[PDB]
Amino acid sequence: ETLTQEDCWTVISSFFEETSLARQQLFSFDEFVQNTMQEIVDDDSTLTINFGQIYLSRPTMTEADGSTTTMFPQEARLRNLTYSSPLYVDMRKEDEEPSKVFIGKIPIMLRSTFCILNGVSDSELYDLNECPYDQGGYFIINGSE
Amino acid sequence: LMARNTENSGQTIRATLPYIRSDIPIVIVFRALGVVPDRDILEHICYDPNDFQMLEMMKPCIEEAFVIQDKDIALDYIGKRGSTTGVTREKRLRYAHDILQKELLPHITTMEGFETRKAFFLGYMIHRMLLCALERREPDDRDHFG
Amino acid sequence: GIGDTIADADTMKEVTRTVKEARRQVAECIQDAQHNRLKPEPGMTLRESFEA
Amino acid sequence: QIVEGKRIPFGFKYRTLPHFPKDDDSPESRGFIENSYLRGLTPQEFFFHAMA
Amino acid sequence: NFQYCIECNNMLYPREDKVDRVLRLACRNCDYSEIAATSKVYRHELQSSNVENTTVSHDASTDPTLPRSDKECPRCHQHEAVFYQTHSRRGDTMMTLIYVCVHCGFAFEEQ
Amino acid sequence: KNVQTQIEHTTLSTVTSATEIHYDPDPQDTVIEEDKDFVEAFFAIPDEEVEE
Amino acid sequence: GSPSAPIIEFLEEWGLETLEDYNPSASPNATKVFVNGVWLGVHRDPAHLTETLRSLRRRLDISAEVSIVRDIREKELRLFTDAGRICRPLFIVDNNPNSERRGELCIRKEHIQQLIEDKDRYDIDPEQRFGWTALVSSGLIEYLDAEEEETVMIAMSPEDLEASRQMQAGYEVKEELDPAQRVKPAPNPHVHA
Numbered sequence: 001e002t003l004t005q006e007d008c009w010t011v012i013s014s015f016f017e018e019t020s021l022a023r024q025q026l027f028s029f030d031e032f033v034q035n036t037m038q039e040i041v042d043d044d045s046t047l048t049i050n051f052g053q054i055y056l057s058r059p060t061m062t063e064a065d066g067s068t069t070t071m072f073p074q075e076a077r078l079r080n081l082t083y084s085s086p087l088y089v090d091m092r093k094e095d096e097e098p099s100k101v102f103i104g105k106i107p108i109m110l111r112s113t114f115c116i117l118n119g120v121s122d123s124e125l126y127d128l129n130e131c132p133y134d135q136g137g138y139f140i141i142n143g144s145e
Numbered sequence: 146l147m148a149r150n151t152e153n154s155g156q157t158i159r160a161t162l163p164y165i166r167s168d169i170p171i172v173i174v175f176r177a178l179g180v181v182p183d184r185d186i187l188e189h190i191c192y193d194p195n196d197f198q199m200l201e202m203m204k205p206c207i208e209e210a211f212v213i214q215d216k217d218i219a220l221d222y223i224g225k226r227g228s229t230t231g232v233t234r235e236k237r238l239r240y241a242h243d244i245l246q247k248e249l250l251p252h253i254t255t256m257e258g259f260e261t262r263k264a265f266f267l268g269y270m271i272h273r274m275l276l277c278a279l280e281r282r283e284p285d286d287r288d289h290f291g
Numbered sequence: 292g293i294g295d296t297i298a299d300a301d302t303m304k305e306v307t308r309t310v311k312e313a314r315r316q317v318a319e320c321i322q323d324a325q326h327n328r329l330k331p332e333p334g335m336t337l338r339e340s341f342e343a
Numbered sequence: 344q345i346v347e348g349k350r351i352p353f354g355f356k357y358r359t360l361p362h363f364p365k366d367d368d369s370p371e372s373r374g375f376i377e378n379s380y381l382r383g384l385t386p387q388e389f390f391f392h393a394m395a
Numbered sequence: 396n397f398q399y400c401i402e403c404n405n406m407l408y409p410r411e412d413k414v415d416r417v418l419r420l421a422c423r424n425c426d427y428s429e430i431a432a433t434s435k436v437y438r439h440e441l442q443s444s445n446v447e448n449t450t451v452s453h454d455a456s457t458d459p460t461l462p463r464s465d466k467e468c469p470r471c472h473q474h475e476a477v478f479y480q481t482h483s484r485r486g487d488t489m490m491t492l493i494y495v496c497v498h499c500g501f502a503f504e505e506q
Numbered sequence: 507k508n509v510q511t512q513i514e515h516t517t518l519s520t521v522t523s524a525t526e527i528h529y530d531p532d533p534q535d536t537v538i539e540e541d542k543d544f545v546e547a548f549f550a551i552p553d554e555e556v557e558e
Numbered sequence: 559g560s561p562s563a564p565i566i567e568f569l570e571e572w573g574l575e576t577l578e579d580y581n582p583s584a585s586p587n588a589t590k591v592f593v594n595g596v597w598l599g600v601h602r603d604p605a606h607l608t609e610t611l612r613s614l615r616r617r618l619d620i621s622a623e624v625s626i627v628r629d630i631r632e633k634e635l636r637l638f639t640d641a642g643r644i645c646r647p648l649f650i651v652d653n654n655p656n657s658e659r660r661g662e663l664c665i666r667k668e669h670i671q672q673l674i675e676d677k678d679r680y681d682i683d684p685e686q687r688f689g690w691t692a693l694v695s696s697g698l699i700e701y702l703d704a705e706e707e708e709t710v711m712i713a714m715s716p717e718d719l720e721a722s723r724q725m726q727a728g729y730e731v732k733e734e735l736d737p738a739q740r741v742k743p744a745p746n747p748h749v750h751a
Binding site: 435 | 532537
């Protein structure tokens with residue numbers, strides 16, 4: 001019972017085991033998402049047409065003479081592709097059921113709660129042409145970080 | 146606050162209350178919430194004893210409301226948005242109430258029946274001011290950050 | 292090299308002596324100017340003529 | 344070390360930093376190192392130096 | 396002292412009693428009129444303090460961030476006592492450094 | 507010092523505490539609030555023109 | 559950021575803490591209470607009110623991002639929570655006194671060895687190798703806001719804390735044994751704990 005300095009590090013190493021660097025960035029976006037945003041659309045969901053909750057959808061791509069295949073960055077990027085996913089808000093006009101209509105697209109931030117990676121093990125990051133050191137924090141809109 | 150022109154007058158304090166329009170002495174706004182009668186208004190600012198010094202400064206402040214003088218006029222002296230409109234009273238009154246529920250200290254509460262809450266804050270605000278002109282503390286530090 | 296930066300061991304004892312021996316010179320100021328026995332002047336003020 | 348003609352300024356509150364009492368008008372805290380770039384500088388000091 | 400007055404609590408204006416020749420306060424709202432309390436009326440004051448007892452460090456003992464003395468708590472009794480000064484903008488408000496015990500609160504001054 | 511204190515603003519700088527307003531009917535009214543009063547009475551006693 | 563609702567639940571409800579009017583003459587003072595600058599409340603003995611809040615952050619019953627303030631010179635007890643605060647994980651002391659005489663350190667070697675049991679991980683479940691993610695759930699390290707500092711008194715190195723504890727009863731300093739090093743400010747100006 002006294003406590004030595006070499007111990008303090010053995011504590012603050014734990015902090016970087018879980019919290020990691022850039023943790024909040026990166027987290028101030030991991031919460032958007034769902035999140036506080038489904039209530040902000042309800043502050044003005046009126047029109048002499050009502051806005052509902054919004055289905056969460058993973059980042060995909062749709063193109064002519066092609067099909068609906070999700071994105072797999074960074075195998076994207078170079079296709080100068082913007083890395084977003086579609087928003088779908090239930091609209092109310094009355095036929096009991098809503099409408100699930102698409103409302104523009106929102107650019108996702110790499111390595112998030114709702115990203116294409118999140119819980120992916122190191123050995124599996126390579127397969128995808130990624131780098132276990134990347135710590136997210138950025139967007140790849142129009143092909144560039 | 147003002148305190149210049151040794152000729153005009155006795156160091157009198159005002160307010161702005163965004164986003165329109167000019168300067169509006171303090172008593173005018175207490176009288177626009179639910180506290181028109183004097184004395185009670187000072188209770189929200191200072192607390193006797195008292196300590197007249199900190200209060201005294203009110204003299205010039207109240208004088209600005211020597212015409213208010215109730216609830217009608219108060220809301221009246223608020224016709225200046227703006228882009229040329231109104232006509233005139235009734236309408237003006239409505240705008241005043243709207244302001245008190247969105248503009249006048251927009252946080253706290255934006256409901257309807259909560260004008261007695263925003264009545265103290267102003268007293269609290271101006272409580273601070275008095276502490277500085279009388280030289281009782283020091284102007285907060287914008288350095289923070291903190 | 293560093294050696295050119297490391298003052299004599301003996302003669303370094305006498306360094307640390309004349310530094311900690313100037314604490315006592317503040318002690319006789321931090322507490323002696325709490326008994327209003329400065330004093331100050333000129334240029335002012337009293338808190339400043341202490342800092343000085 | 345200095346700053347605008349006055350040893351390390353106070354604020355926040357009535358203190359140089361949160362590793363000190365209040366009204367600590369002593370060098371052992373307010374910008375003032377005792378060691379050189381050899382030992383050399385102590386945390387509670389290192390910062391004072393960087394901000395000067 | 397210049398106060399308000401019953402009925403319609405409001406400001407009180409000064410008013411001499413010529414004929415009689417005495418003090419007498421009143422208001423511009425109603426009519427109420429009470430006698431004076433002292434010859435004094437208004438004071439200037441260029442500034443010479445404004446704390447006296449600055450009531451009342453009643454929150455110093457719980458101020459983990461404050462210094463403390465050692466025995467000698469005039470009156471009451473016990474050891475340990477927190478202190479502190481004032482220093483407000485300008486001065487030179489010397490340093491009437493005061494104190495307060497932890498098991499009481501007697502603003503025991505000192506030279 | 508003859509000159510040191512022979513070219514200064516001066517004016518009402520010694521009062522700075524200050525100006526008080528008392529209402530006193532008869533030319534022989536006072537109170538206090540302290541001592542004085544006596545001096546005033548002595549000045550009136552010399553009735554050298556009081557009426558004027 | 560954390561919801562500004564469930565926060566007043568632990569305030570209006572406890573205690574007593576009364577809103578509405580309560581001003582003419584009595585109360586104040588009687589200190590007040592802001593929250594996100596929203597001064598709804600008067601509250602009396604801040605004493606009980608604070609210690610019991612701070613222990614809500616040590617169990618995590620409330621978001622750990624909440625600051626607390628006790629301006630014993632301007633009254634008031636500001637309580638922020640809106641997003642944009644900055645933190646800084648520290649160690650604490652918790653001095654009642656009660657256990658272990660007076661102080662002192664709030665972690666035990668025990669704790670640490672336990673931490674290392676998770677570096678060797680993974681190898682379990684949740685559970686969950688309590689590696690920091692719990693070192694706050696156990697009231698060991700408090701995150702401090704920038705405005706929370708004002709009311710606090712941190713230490714630099716454990717050595718300084720140990721020396722202060724020894725003085726509280728008179729204990730040699732031993733300054734004639736140290737060798738070329740960062741000459742600290744010895745011993746310790748006042749500051750009992």
